[PDB]
Design a protein around this ligand. Structure first.
Ligand SMILES: NC(=O)c1ccc[n+]([C@@H]2O[C@H](COP(=O)([O-])OP(=O)(O)OC[C@H]3O[C@@H](n4cnc5c(N)ncnc54)[C@H](OP(=O)(O)O)[C@@H]3O)[C@@H](O)[C@H]2O)c1
Ligand SMILES: CCc1nc(N)nc(N)c1OCCCOc1ccccc1C[C@H](C)C(=O)O
Ligand SMILES: [Cl-]
Length: 186
């Protein structure tokens, strides 16, 4: 099993969601970036694992669930079985990561990507060990009801460049944004 990563897109006021949708209008290349980063595996014959909370699962359109080309895992203590379309369900991130040590996942999974929401990012960012945060800074305020926790800059380093990730300002639909990559190893 490869590296542990978070990936998020976040507005200037730290928002990540609104009424079960993104706070901003659709940004095609931000979506393409999310898809390519979470799908691309360094290892032949393996797929990456995407871990998400229950609300994030149901925020994906039914036609696009489960996320194609990736193994999907949902977090919930209320659900008794993985939701329709999913095959894995854990009560916590700690349980999900321990599940990657069992043969049904250990042989199949390369990278692990946490894709939201708020409480999943919170558990991951405090998880000990090597972690990277792939953070898209949307350079505007948007009305939000779900937020990204502030990054502890005493634990994380901001990388000036990361391989395959453009470091310049992006713009779509009048909205500027930037791809950032943070890293820690405690
Ligand atoms: N901009 C982005 O990058 C991004 C990414 C993802 C989602 N979103 C948007 O954010 C919103 C959804 O995110 P959200 O924060 O509201 O909810 P969420 O984390 O996806 O789902 C919350 C539910 O999932 C379970 N859960 C979450 N964290 C858990 C943990 N560490 N351990 C065990 N269970 C956990 C709990 O379910 P139970 O109550 O059943 O236990 C919780 O009620 C939507 O608006 C979505 O469009 C944005
Ligand atoms: C692109 C947004 C994003 N970007 C970054 N960088 N990291 C994230 N974790 C993140 O969330 C992705 C959650 C998965 O959403 C999918 C996935 C496939 C199809 C449709 C949706 C729902 C769309 C986004 C909506 O809600 O409109
Ligand atoms: Cl921050």
């Amino acid at each position: 099993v490869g590296s542990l990563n978070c990936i998020v897109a976040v507005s200037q006021n730290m928002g990540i969601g609104k009424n079960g949708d993104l706070p901003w209008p659709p940004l095609r290349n931000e979506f393409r970036y999310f898809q390519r980063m979470t799908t691309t595996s360094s290892v032949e014959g393996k797929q990456n694992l995407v871990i998400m909370g229950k609300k994030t699962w149901f925020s994906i359109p039914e036609k696009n669930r489960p996320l194609k080309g990736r193994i999907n895992l949902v977090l919930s203590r209320e659900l008794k079985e993985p939701p329709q379309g999913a095959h894995f369900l854990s009560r916590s991130l700690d349980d999900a990561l321990k599940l990657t040590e069992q043969p049904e996942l250990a042989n199949k999974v390369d990278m692990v990507w946490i894709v939201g929401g708020s409480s999943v990012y919170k558990e991951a960012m405090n998880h000990p060990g090597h972690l990277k945060l792939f953070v898209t800074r949307i350079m505007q305020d948007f009305e939000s009801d779900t937020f990204f926790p502030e990054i502890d800059l005493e634990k994380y380093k901001l990388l000036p460049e990361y391989p395959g990730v453009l470091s310049d300002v992006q713009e779509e639909k009048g909205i500027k944004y930037k791809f950032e990559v943070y890293e820690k190893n405690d």
